[PDB]
RNA sequence: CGCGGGGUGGAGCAGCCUGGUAGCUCGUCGGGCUCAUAACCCGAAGGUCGUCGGUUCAAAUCCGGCCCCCGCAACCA
RNA sequence: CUUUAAUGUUUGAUGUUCUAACGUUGACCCGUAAUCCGGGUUGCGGACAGUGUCUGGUGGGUAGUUUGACUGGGGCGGUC
RNA sequence: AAUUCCUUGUCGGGUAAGUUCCGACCUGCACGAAUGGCGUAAUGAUGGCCAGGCUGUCUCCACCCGAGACUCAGUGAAAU
RNA sequence: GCUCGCCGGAAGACCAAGGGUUCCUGUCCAACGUUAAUCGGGGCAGGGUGAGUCGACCCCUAAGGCGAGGCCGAAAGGCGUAGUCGAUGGGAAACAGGUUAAUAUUCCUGUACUUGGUGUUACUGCGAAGGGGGGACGGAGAAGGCUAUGUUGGCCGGGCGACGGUUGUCCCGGUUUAAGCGUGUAGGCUGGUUUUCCAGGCAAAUCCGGAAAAUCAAGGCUGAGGCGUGAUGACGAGGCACUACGGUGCUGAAGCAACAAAUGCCCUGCUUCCAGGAAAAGCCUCUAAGCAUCAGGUAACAUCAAAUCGUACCCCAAACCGACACAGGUGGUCAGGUAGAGAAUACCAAGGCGCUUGAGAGAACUCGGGUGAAGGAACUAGGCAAAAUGGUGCCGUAACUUCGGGAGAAGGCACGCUGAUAUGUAGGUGAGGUCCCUCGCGGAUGGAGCUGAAAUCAGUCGAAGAUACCAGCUGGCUGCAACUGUUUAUUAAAAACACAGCACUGUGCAAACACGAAAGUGGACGUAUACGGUGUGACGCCUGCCCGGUGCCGGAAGGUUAAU
RNA sequence: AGGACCGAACCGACUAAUGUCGAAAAAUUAGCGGAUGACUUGUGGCUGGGGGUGAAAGGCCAAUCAAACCGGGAGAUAGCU
RNA sequence: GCUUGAGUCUCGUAGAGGGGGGUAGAAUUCCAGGUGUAGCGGUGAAAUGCGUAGAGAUCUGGAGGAAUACCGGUGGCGAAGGCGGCCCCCUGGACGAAGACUGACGCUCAGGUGCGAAAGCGUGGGGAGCAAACAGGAUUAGAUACCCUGGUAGUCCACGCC
């Protein structure tokens, strides 16, 4: 069958990357939330 | 001419193609082009603002002139081209001074005749001259609204406008739909009936004939689900309701003339 | 089992709804007109307003019983 | 009191004209090599149109809810 | 009749035998002319019926060849 | 290691995507592998990724994102100009051979090419966010010329052979060579050059476009392959030579011709048809504001620079995605021999594998199949499943029809091998020789060699010659839908939806309608032969009566009627 | 020329059996339909929860759809178990 | 061979002959405005219909499509059907005149081809009046007829068919 995951680093970083969430206000508090919980993997990054 | 192809496949058995022999069978002028990509009827918010739009062939745009701001300069036509961004034929006419400009190809015009643009011109097919200098009652097209906009009246195949009155600063026309309206008399209006007049005889034949021209298949309202269309439902084709548009207003008779900043100029509605 | 409407000269409908006065077409009897029939023209008779009781000056009328008729009733697993 | 006539005065409903509000997804110039836009000339409309506030109508396009119970199961009929 | 309740309606044809099917009679519970009516060449992984051909589908299964099932040695679940 | 078997348009060999050392070596077996395990994609340790020419970065754009000001919006924030980002696109330049346990168009050898900087010499006018050309393009179809590659032969090397023959028309192996430079062909496109003038290209212009004259008829642009050169170099079968017995050192013959032939190249061609087929930069060129003993540009030569990153391995899978070492899914390129129309298929070459539980037994029963007496749908909801039909050429072929079909209708005949016609034909290709010449990759002519259908006749073999794999079941009546197509991914693929066609109705452009508090957009840079809604659904013959109820349109006199 | 015919790659999923704690949370095997077109496919984007998309099934929107998921209202409420 | 058959050439005549393209005037209808007011229209009579929201009547302006009053005549032309306001372009036949020339080149004609009122049909326009079907009002025993008020196709144009 066709499993729901066709990885693509650029596509993964174009709309889920660091700057993409650092792009606007709402995404900014996403990191405010994850920084509050303190995830080592702050965002899906390199 | 007006020909029908012989039947090979059920779809070719109803194909009437409009073959014009005098069409330019080569590639067109370069400097007068620009990419005219489509967006499938979607806007800034990308939603389908207008239905039945999407797909189709990838084609380019030719900046065809309507304005005709060139004055008192003779110009000889050179090539007849059927443009993919119209319904009527355009003609490559070279303005003697050194520039080629695309204009709508009229009925009485051979790609090799000399047209002249200006008020000094007589009454011959293809010339741009004011209506006040024209014996009212003639047959013209590409009539302007603003004295310098270009012409937004009768710009399709086999189309024209009958000139009714010329009372002073106003020129009352009888549009193609029959709408009697006055316009500023100093405007420009080109003579002659628009060519490519056998366009209405063009039957498409197969389903694809309308598909590659962009028009998407229309899904009827009785086909929809009660949640989708205001109609929908009906177990076994039960309509029983007054026909409406997918958003409320009762169609098949509901005039939408709500302008008022320009309602005044009309003399007769289409009645 | 129920609900709604009607019951008016030989045929069928008005009038009822909103109480004092009962009409129309065909038909019946008959004449004339035609040689004859029908048709036509014209006049008259013909209605206990299904039935009984109640109420008010007067009951076809307003109401309550009995009888007759038309439609729907003989489902959902 | 009624019918009525000239005038003063007081507001209103229409018709036409005008230009200054306003509109201008008309032309041209400049900012500016920039189809956005702003300003400047000019033309075409014109106290319209359009927008705010109040208001009548319409309105399942949209939203919140109601849609009884008894019943020899429920529904139907009936009843309270 | 994708519609006909009554009904397997009536008659004819197909079969030795036809609640299906084909052609007709109209008694249309309750077809009907763009929620289109009636025909229709071509087309169809479409519904129904029939014939030829061909065969294990069946009368009635019989044998054989491989993979499991059975035994042995190693590993070793599961619903409950 | 020797046999056996499997794929062989793949289960082979290289990449992108994506993973992340799974690559190579040594060592170890508790834990991982559905078994054992000295084995391994498992543990520990060490090693490996070398670039001016590959890709990216870079230059420049597309869909689209963001967006100085600006418009707008309770706020957040939304759209959008100038700009700036963003490939799946375009834009400079390298190939062959050898080598490692693992990498190499990157290292080495040999032989080339590209873009800039600086300096020198000799000439010469150069110069933009501006203009022009170019870049720059569609589907399909047919033809010609070649190549990749393959076959045969010649030649060279070796053998002449464990059971009959085999020095001969015998057998086997090899017979390979790029980028670049020069030549500029087969073929395609286009008439050149000179003079003058010009409301044209937001300004200018010698560049382009246009209008008249002149002279001559070719010039120019482009272009696969061949041929020389690259290269008396490399590689090269097989010997010669030492073994840690894995492999290394050395040497080295032939290295051509002919035929057939790609979906590859010429071709970003040519013909034709319609649904009418990116943008910008690099590049070439003209001038503006200007700068001229300059600065710069052109040409030759010398020298220098080409930085940063990726480079291992897997890449139709035990390394990606699916929880797994999962019978599933994953884009592109290369792609031989024989038979065959073919990339189908069958058997093989190259190369890679036997699927990480096996050994016995041969019951019932279950699954995948083979065969079957007589009958042949009697089975069953139903011919479901099986069986059968199945290829080429030729003969022949109905009702009906929109005159295209129906149709490969149905139904039949010949199919192998050998010789002959003919020491292998028609056809295809084509050297030498000869002649000519505006002498070159030339034109006629000439015919060796090579290759090679099909048809007729005769003979013979078997039961059967499309002998395998492969490969339609057919006809008749009829309902519905026109047809191709689409849909309930994961129980419904149809009569449902769509469909071209038709009709009604709304719409005069700042159009209706729609998304959006607004601005702004789509519609459409379209404008009534146009765009939107609805209904039906080819074509043919037609589409009757009803305006009472509801909705809608028009008309407003009167009654009534909110705020004020 | 053909929404042309036959038929591989490719895409789809009509029938039958196997399978159903499977090899697989819809596949395999043997036959099938389309296969120059309304075709298929890679890469990169845009449209989003009462909204998007829809050759219209109330299908699809990350194994979840007559209104996705995640967190917060919220220990919602439950005459019921 | 010849010419009385037939055909051709020179100069003229009349004509709704045909096709294509312009144009004019009267009338009818509609629309807009001004004046003005209870009928208008219709028939054997009446009614439907139109009208006090102001018709009809009347004046002015504008837009239309179709047919061409008088001239018009048992007049003309053409094979027949058929064809008439005027003007232009292209064009067919017939007839008269005085001669020449070719020298039987002729008559008809199954099959075949072409043309062919109206009605009807297909495609795309147009659409005043008129008017199948149809509706209503009357007549009538019945009237899906005759009469009257409205009225779709069609009638008109370009290309084909019958």
mmCIF file of N, CA, C and O (backbone and C1' of nucleotides) in Angstrom, chain F residues 356-392:
data_model
loop_
_atom_site.group_PDB
_atom_site.id
_atom_site.type_symbol
_atom_site.label_atom_id
_atom_site.label_comp_id
_atom_site.label_asym_id
_atom_site.label_seq_id
_atom_site.Cartn_x
_atom_site.Cartn_y
_atom_site.Cartn_z
ATOM 1 P P U F 356 15.504 -15.530 4.206
ATOM 2 O "O5'" U F 356 16.602 -16.592 4.661
ATOM 3 C "C5'" U F 356 16.266 -17.984 4.824
ATOM 4 C "C4'" U F 356 16.388 -18.388 6.276
ATOM 5 C "C3'" U F 356 15.733 -17.447 7.282
ATOM 6 O "O3'" U F 356 15.226 -18.219 8.364
ATOM 7 C "C1'" U F 356 18.031 -17.623 7.759
ATOM 8 P P U F 357 13.649 -18.212 8.678
ATOM 9 O "O5'" U F 357 13.373 -19.669 9.265
ATOM 10 C "C5'" U F 357 13.254 -20.808 8.386
ATOM 11 C "C4'" U F 357 14.257 -21.868 8.767
ATOM 12 C "C3'" U F 357 14.260 -23.134 7.924
ATOM 13 O "O3'" U F 357 14.968 -22.947 6.696
ATOM 14 C "C1'" U F 357 14.354 -23.716 10.208
ATOM 15 P P G F 358 14.811 -24.022 5.509
ATOM 16 O "O5'" G F 358 15.712 -25.243 5.990
ATOM 17 C "C5'" G F 358 15.455 -26.583 5.533
ATOM 18 C "C4'" G F 358 16.143 -27.576 6.439
ATOM 19 C "C3'" G F 358 15.788 -29.035 6.206
ATOM 20 O "O3'" G F 358 16.553 -29.593 5.143
ATOM 21 C "C1'" G F 358 15.635 -28.555 8.512
ATOM 22 P P A F 359 15.960 -30.821 4.290
ATOM 23 O "O5'" A F 359 16.008 -32.049 5.304
ATOM 24 C "C5'" A F 359 17.267 -32.606 5.737
ATOM 25 C "C4'" A F 359 17.037 -33.722 6.727
ATOM 26 C "C3'" A F 359 16.094 -34.827 6.277
ATOM 27 O "O3'" A F 359 16.754 -35.795 5.470
ATOM 28 C "C1'" A F 359 15.494 -34.126 8.450
ATOM 29 P P G F 360 15.894 -36.753 4.506
ATOM 30 O "O5'" G F 360 15.051 -37.652 5.517
ATOM 31 C "C5'" G F 360 13.950 -38.460 5.053
ATOM 32 C "C4'" G F 360 13.246 -39.102 6.228
ATOM 33 C "C3'" G F 360 11.909 -39.751 5.908
ATOM 34 O "O3'" G F 360 12.077 -41.083 5.427
ATOM 35 C "C1'" G F 360 11.679 -38.359 7.809
ATOM 36 P P A F 361 11.118 -41.645 4.264
ATOM 37 O "O5'" A F 361 9.658 -41.605 4.904
ATOM 38 C "C5'" A F 361 9.298 -42.496 5.980
ATOM 39 C "C4'" A F 361 7.907 -42.182 6.482
ATOM 40 C "C3'" A F 361 6.789 -42.214 5.450
ATOM 41 O "O3'" A F 361 6.336 -43.547 5.231
ATOM 42 C "C1'" A F 361 6.573 -40.283 6.805
ATOM 43 P P G F 362 6.118 -44.086 3.731
ATOM 44 O "O5'" G F 362 4.847 -43.278 3.202
ATOM 45 C "C5'" G F 362 3.624 -43.247 3.963
ATOM 46 C "C4'" G F 362 2.752 -42.087 3.528
ATOM 47 C "C3'" G F 362 2.190 -42.135 2.108
ATOM 48 O "O3'" G F 362 0.931 -41.463 2.106
ATOM 49 C "C1'" G F 362 3.512 -40.212 2.347
ATOM 50 P P A F 363 -0.357 -42.163 1.444
ATOM 51 O "O5'" A F 363 -1.561 -41.703 2.385
ATOM 52 C "C5'" A F 363 -1.352 -41.488 3.796
ATOM 53 C "C4'" A F 363 -2.640 -41.679 4.562
ATOM 54 C "C3'" A F 363 -3.714 -40.626 4.332
ATOM 55 O "O3'" A F 363 -4.487 -40.898 3.166
ATOM 56 C "C1'" A F 363 -3.438 -40.962 6.653
ATOM 57 P P A F 364 -5.254 -39.696 2.420
ATOM 58 O "O5'" A F 364 -6.379 -39.243 3.459
ATOM 59 C "C5'" A F 364 -7.472 -40.122 3.800
ATOM 60 C "C4'" A F 364 -8.303 -39.531 4.920
ATOM 61 C "C3'" A F 364 -8.936 -38.174 4.660
ATOM 62 O "O3'" A F 364 -10.154 -38.298 3.928
ATOM 63 C "C1'" A F 364 -7.941 -38.185 6.807
ATOM 64 P P C F 365 -10.475 -37.280 2.726
ATOM 65 O "O5'" C F 365 -10.248 -35.834 3.361
ATOM 66 C "C5'" C F 365 -11.179 -35.294 4.317
ATOM 67 C "C4'" C F 365 -10.607 -34.061 4.975
ATOM 68 C "C3'" C F 365 -10.217 -32.927 4.040
ATOM 69 O "O3'" C F 365 -11.340 -32.126 3.682
ATOM 70 C "C1'" C F 365 -8.466 -33.312 5.577
ATOM 71 P P U F 366 -11.314 -31.277 2.315
ATOM 72 O "O5'" U F 366 -10.167 -30.191 2.547
ATOM 73 C "C5'" U F 366 -10.411 -29.022 3.357
ATOM 74 C "C4'" U F 366 -9.237 -28.069 3.290
ATOM 75 C "C3'" U F 366 -8.782 -27.637 1.905
ATOM 76 O "O3'" U F 366 -9.605 -26.601 1.371
ATOM 77 C "C1'" U F 366 -6.896 -28.202 3.211
ATOM 78 P P C F 367 -9.694 -26.389 -0.223
ATOM 79 O "O5'" C F 367 -8.269 -25.793 -0.618
ATOM 80 C "C5'" C F 367 -7.857 -24.493 -0.147
ATOM 81 C "C4'" C F 367 -6.436 -24.197 -0.572
ATOM 82 C "C3'" C F 367 -6.146 -24.294 -2.060
ATOM 83 O "O3'" C F 367 -6.540 -23.122 -2.762
ATOM 84 C "C1'" C F 367 -4.457 -25.425 -0.863
ATOM 85 P P G F 368 -6.867 -23.204 -4.334
ATOM 86 O "O5'" G F 368 -5.454 -23.519 -5.004
ATOM 87 C "C5'" G F 368 -4.433 -22.501 -5.091
ATOM 88 C "C4'" G F 368 -3.254 -23.005 -5.892
ATOM 89 C "C3'" G F 368 -3.581 -23.627 -7.240
ATOM 90 O "O3'" G F 368 -3.777 -22.634 -8.245
ATOM 91 C "C1'" G F 368 -2.050 -25.012 -6.085
ATOM 92 P P G F 369 -4.572 -23.009 -9.592
ATOM 93 O "O5'" G F 369 -3.656 -24.125 -10.265
ATOM 94 C "C5'" G F 369 -4.211 -25.106 -11.161
ATOM 95 C "C4'" G F 369 -3.188 -26.179 -11.448
ATOM 96 C "C3'" G F 369 -3.662 -27.313 -12.336
ATOM 97 O "O3'" G F 369 -3.601 -26.938 -13.710
ATOM 98 C "C1'" G F 369 -2.500 -28.201 -10.476
ATOM 99 P P G F 370 -4.454 -27.755 -14.802
ATOM 100 O "O5'" G F 370 -3.738 -29.177 -14.855
ATOM 101 C "C5'" G F 370 -2.396 -29.313 -15.371
ATOM 102 C "C4'" G F 370 -1.999 -30.770 -15.442
ATOM 103 C "C3'" G F 370 -3.010 -31.690 -16.107
ATOM 104 O "O3'" G F 370 -2.900 -31.634 -17.526
ATOM 105 C "C1'" G F 370 -2.244 -32.674 -14.095
ATOM 106 P P U F 371 -4.211 -31.813 -18.438
ATOM 107 O "O5'" U F 371 -4.641 -33.326 -18.189
ATOM 108 C "C5'" U F 371 -3.815 -34.411 -18.655
ATOM 109 C "C4'" U F 371 -4.392 -35.739 -18.228
ATOM 110 C "C3'" U F 371 -5.863 -35.961 -18.531
ATOM 111 O "O3'" U F 371 -6.077 -36.316 -19.893
ATOM 112 C "C1'" U F 371 -5.387 -36.698 -16.336
ATOM 113 P P G F 372 -7.492 -35.992 -20.592
ATOM 114 O "O5'" G F 372 -8.492 -37.034 -19.921
ATOM 115 C "C5'" G F 372 -8.286 -38.450 -20.084
ATOM 116 C "C4'" G F 372 -9.205 -39.235 -19.176
ATOM 117 C "C3'" G F 372 -10.693 -38.946 -19.289
ATOM 118 O "O3'" G F 372 -11.246 -39.620 -20.415
ATOM 119 C "C1'" G F 372 -10.077 -39.178 -17.012
ATOM 120 P P A F 373 -12.777 -39.359 -20.843
ATOM 121 O "O5'" A F 373 -13.374 -40.831 -20.969
ATOM 122 C "C5'" A F 373 -12.584 -41.907 -21.525
ATOM 123 C "C4'" A F 373 -13.212 -43.241 -21.199
ATOM 124 C "C3'" A F 373 -14.688 -43.349 -21.532
ATOM 125 O "O3'" A F 373 -14.852 -43.658 -22.910
ATOM 126 C "C1'" A F 373 -14.297 -44.205 -19.360
ATOM 127 P P A F 374 -15.535 -42.587 -23.892
ATOM 128 O "O5'" A F 374 -17.070 -42.615 -23.468
ATOM 129 C "C5'" A F 374 -17.905 -43.741 -23.802
ATOM 130 C "C4'" A F 374 -19.263 -43.601 -23.160
ATOM 131 C "C3'" A F 374 -19.912 -42.232 -23.263
ATOM 132 O "O3'" A F 374 -20.498 -42.006 -24.539
ATOM 133 C "C1'" A F 374 -20.146 -43.047 -21.060
ATOM 134 P P G F 375 -20.482 -40.526 -25.169
ATOM 135 O "O5'" G F 375 -21.443 -39.696 -24.206
ATOM 136 C "C5'" G F 375 -22.801 -40.119 -23.996
ATOM 137 C "C4'" G F 375 -23.416 -39.382 -22.829
ATOM 138 C "C3'" G F 375 -23.413 -37.865 -22.896
ATOM 139 O "O3'" G F 375 -24.429 -37.371 -23.762
ATOM 140 C "C1'" G F 375 -22.917 -38.591 -20.694
ATOM 141 P P G F 376 -24.164 -36.040 -24.629
ATOM 142 O "O5'" G F 376 -23.996 -34.891 -23.540
ATOM 143 C "C5'" G F 376 -25.009 -34.656 -22.546
ATOM 144 C "C4'" G F 376 -24.587 -33.531 -21.626
ATOM 145 C "C3'" G F 376 -24.298 -32.200 -22.309
ATOM 146 O "O3'" G F 376 -24.632 -31.138 -21.423
ATOM 147 C "C1'" G F 376 -22.318 -33.011 -21.295
ATOM 148 P P A F 377 -25.914 -30.217 -21.732
ATOM 149 O "O5'" A F 377 -26.220 -29.505 -20.337
ATOM 150 C "C5'" A F 377 -26.907 -30.213 -19.283
ATOM 151 C "C4'" A F 377 -26.980 -29.366 -18.032
ATOM 152 C "C3'" A F 377 -27.488 -27.937 -18.215
ATOM 153 O "O3'" A F 377 -28.227 -27.541 -17.061
ATOM 154 C "C1'" A F 377 -25.326 -27.893 -17.277
ATOM 155 P P A F 378 -29.788 -27.918 -16.940
ATOM 156 O "O5'" A F 378 -29.760 -29.462 -16.543
ATOM 157 C "C5'" A F 378 -30.930 -30.128 -16.027
ATOM 158 C "C4'" A F 378 -30.536 -31.437 -15.381
ATOM 159 C "C3'" A F 378 -29.568 -31.316 -14.214
ATOM 160 O "O3'" A F 378 -30.278 -31.012 -13.012
ATOM 161 C "C1'" A F 378 -28.920 -33.104 -15.647
ATOM 162 P P C F 379 -30.096 -29.577 -12.305
ATOM 163 O "O5'" C F 379 -28.547 -29.514 -11.936
ATOM 164 C "C5'" C F 379 -27.925 -30.554 -11.149
ATOM 165 C "C4'" C F 379 -26.637 -30.049 -10.543
ATOM 166 C "C3'" C F 379 -26.791 -28.834 -9.640
ATOM 167 O "O3'" C F 379 -27.101 -29.235 -8.307
ATOM 168 C "C1'" C F 379 -25.055 -28.448 -11.199
ATOM 169 P P U F 380 -28.349 -28.577 -7.534
ATOM 170 O "O5'" U F 380 -28.002 -27.023 -7.475
ATOM 171 C "C5'" U F 380 -26.878 -26.542 -6.707
ATOM 172 C "C4'" U F 380 -26.499 -25.148 -7.148
ATOM 173 C "C3'" U F 380 -27.608 -24.110 -7.079
ATOM 174 O "O3'" U F 380 -27.774 -23.583 -5.765
ATOM 175 C "C1'" U F 380 -26.530 -23.956 -9.172
ATOM 176 P P A F 381 -29.232 -23.120 -5.267
ATOM 177 O "O5'" A F 381 -29.562 -21.841 -6.159
ATOM 178 C "C5'" A F 381 -30.911 -21.333 -6.252
ATOM 179 C "C4'" A F 381 -30.920 -19.993 -6.951
ATOM 180 C "C3'" A F 381 -30.202 -19.949 -8.289
ATOM 181 O "O3'" A F 381 -31.055 -20.411 -9.327
ATOM 182 C "C1'" A F 381 -29.550 -18.091 -6.974
ATOM 183 P P G F 382 -30.496 -21.437 -10.432
ATOM 184 O "O5'" G F 382 -29.445 -20.573 -11.264
ATOM 185 C "C5'" G F 382 -29.891 -19.491 -12.108
ATOM 186 C "C4'" G F 382 -28.713 -18.684 -12.610
ATOM 187 C "C3'" G F 382 -27.648 -19.434 -13.399
ATOM 188 O "O3'" G F 382 -28.039 -19.605 -14.760
ATOM 189 C "C1'" G F 382 -26.621 -17.955 -11.856
ATOM 190 P P G F 383 -27.634 -20.947 -15.549
ATOM 191 O "O5'" G F 383 -26.048 -21.041 -15.388
ATOM 192 C "C5'" G F 383 -25.170 -20.138 -16.095
ATOM 193 C "C4'" G F 383 -23.727 -20.392 -15.706
ATOM 194 C "C3'" G F 383 -22.691 -19.578 -16.474
ATOM 195 O "O3'" G F 383 -21.581 -19.291 -15.626
ATOM 196 C "C1'" G F 383 -22.341 -21.882 -16.890
ATOM 197 P P C F 384 -21.162 -17.763 -15.357
ATOM 198 O "O5'" C F 384 -20.173 -17.841 -14.108
ATOM 199 C "C5'" C F 384 -19.980 -16.701 -13.245
ATOM 200 C "C4'" C F 384 -19.343 -17.131 -11.946
ATOM 201 C "C3'" C F 384 -17.979 -17.793 -12.078
ATOM 202 O "O3'" C F 384 -16.943 -16.816 -12.128
ATOM 203 C "C1'" C F 384 -19.363 -19.115 -10.689
ATOM 204 P P A F 385 -15.677 -17.031 -13.096
ATOM 205 O "O5'" A F 385 -15.044 -18.413 -12.619
ATOM 206 C "C5'" A F 385 -14.435 -18.548 -11.316
ATOM 207 C "C4'" A F 385 -14.158 -20.004 -11.020
ATOM 208 C "C3'" A F 385 -13.236 -20.710 -12.005
ATOM 209 O "O3'" A F 385 -11.867 -20.522 -11.642
ATOM 210 C "C1'" A F 385 -15.192 -21.999 -11.698
ATOM 211 P P A F 386 -10.701 -20.793 -12.718
ATOM 212 O "O5'" A F 386 -10.507 -22.375 -12.700
ATOM 213 C "C5'" A F 386 -9.868 -23.044 -13.803
ATOM 214 C "C4'" A F 386 -10.586 -24.332 -14.118
ATOM 215 C "C3'" A F 386 -10.399 -24.830 -15.543
ATOM 216 O "O3'" A F 386 -9.194 -25.581 -15.687
ATOM 217 C "C1'" A F 386 -12.699 -24.851 -14.990
ATOM 218 P P A F 387 -8.278 -25.387 -16.996
ATOM 219 O "O5'" A F 387 -9.185 -25.936 -18.187
ATOM 220 C "C5'" A F 387 -9.525 -27.334 -18.271
ATOM 221 C "C4'" A F 387 -10.601 -27.552 -19.306
ATOM 222 C "C3'" A F 387 -10.294 -27.046 -20.708
ATOM 223 O "O3'" A F 387 -9.509 -27.986 -21.438
ATOM 224 C "C1'" A F 387 -12.469 -26.367 -20.080
ATOM 225 P P A F 388 -8.449 -27.471 -22.534
ATOM 226 O "O5'" A F 388 -9.344 -26.757 -23.644
ATOM 227 C "C5'" A F 388 -10.267 -27.516 -24.452
ATOM 228 C "C4'" A F 388 -11.196 -26.589 -25.201
ATOM 229 C "C3'" A F 388 -10.533 -25.589 -26.137
ATOM 230 O "O3'" A F 388 -10.243 -26.180 -27.404
ATOM 231 C "C1'" A F 388 -12.135 -24.476 -24.799
ATOM 232 P P U F 389 -9.058 -25.586 -28.317
ATOM 233 O "O5'" U F 389 -9.600 -24.159 -28.781
ATOM 234 C "C5'" U F 389 -10.656 -24.056 -29.759
ATOM 235 C "C4'" U F 389 -11.088 -22.616 -29.926
ATOM 236 C "C3'" U F 389 -10.013 -21.623 -30.343
ATOM 237 O "O3'" U F 389 -9.809 -21.647 -31.755
ATOM 238 C "C1'" U F 389 -11.307 -20.707 -28.584
ATOM 239 P P G F 390 -8.317 -21.586 -32.357
ATOM 240 O "O5'" G F 390 -7.708 -20.228 -31.786
ATOM 241 C "C5'" G F 390 -8.384 -18.970 -31.991
ATOM 242 C "C4'" G F 390 -7.703 -17.865 -31.211
ATOM 243 C "C3'" G F 390 -6.260 -17.547 -31.594
ATOM 244 O "O3'" G F 390 -6.014 -16.159 -31.383
ATOM 245 C "C1'" G F 390 -6.336 -18.242 -29.342
ATOM 246 P P G F 391 -5.603 -15.221 -32.624
ATOM 247 O "O5'" G F 391 -4.123 -15.680 -33.001
ATOM 248 C "C5'" G F 391 -2.971 -14.993 -32.468
ATOM 249 C "C4'" G F 391 -1.807 -15.099 -33.429
ATOM 250 C "C3'" G F 391 -2.060 -14.614 -34.850
ATOM 251 O "O3'" G F 391 -1.916 -13.198 -34.954
ATOM 252 C "C1'" G F 391 -0.990 -16.721 -34.915
ATOM 253 P P U F 392 -2.635 -12.404 -36.155
ATOM 254 O "O5'" U F 392 -1.798 -12.812 -37.450
ATOM 255 C "C5'" U F 392 -0.437 -12.366 -37.622
ATOM 256 C "C4'" U F 392 0.173 -12.988 -38.858
ATOM 257 C "C3'" U F 392 -0.582 -12.769 -40.160
ATOM 258 O "O3'" U F 392 -0.293 -11.494 -40.728
ATOM 259 C "C1'" U F 392 0.031 -15.043 -39.981
#
